[PDB]
Design a binder for this molecule. Structure first.
Ligand SMILES: [Mg+2]
Lengths: 69, 68
């Protein structure tokens, strides 16, 4: 039904094309925590782009969700 | 000698004057408060010069750049 929303606590400059770049304050959808065997890397979607993100650079936006569509 | 400084944070540049960088990157500090700009430093990272907020960096004691 619902995906977690998370807010960036820090900037993130992608080190590879699989990683999202984002700025502090950006709000993204969490598609999968610890995606594809990674520990600490979350698959997220931000303004239509998808990539992995270090989970420890985010905070969960409590109570706020994005529909799985 | 020019000072070296380490990034404490990643930094997304939004204009070509600014450098983008990742936490842990080490850059050369060419000029602090460059052009009289409070807290903006002229730095070089991997051969690109731009301005960087000093408050994202940590000066590395005893470490200096000298161009080959
Ligand atoms: Mg990184």
């Amino acid at each position: 039904h619902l995906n977690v929303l998370a807010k960036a606590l820090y900037d993130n400059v992608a080190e590879s094309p699989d990683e999202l770049s984002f700025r502090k304050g950006d709000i993204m959808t969490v598609l999968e925590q610890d995606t594809q065997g990674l520990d600490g890397w979350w698959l997220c979607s931000l303004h239509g782009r998808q990539g992995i993100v270090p989970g420890n650079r985010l905070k969960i936006l409590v109570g706020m969700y994005d529909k799985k569509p």
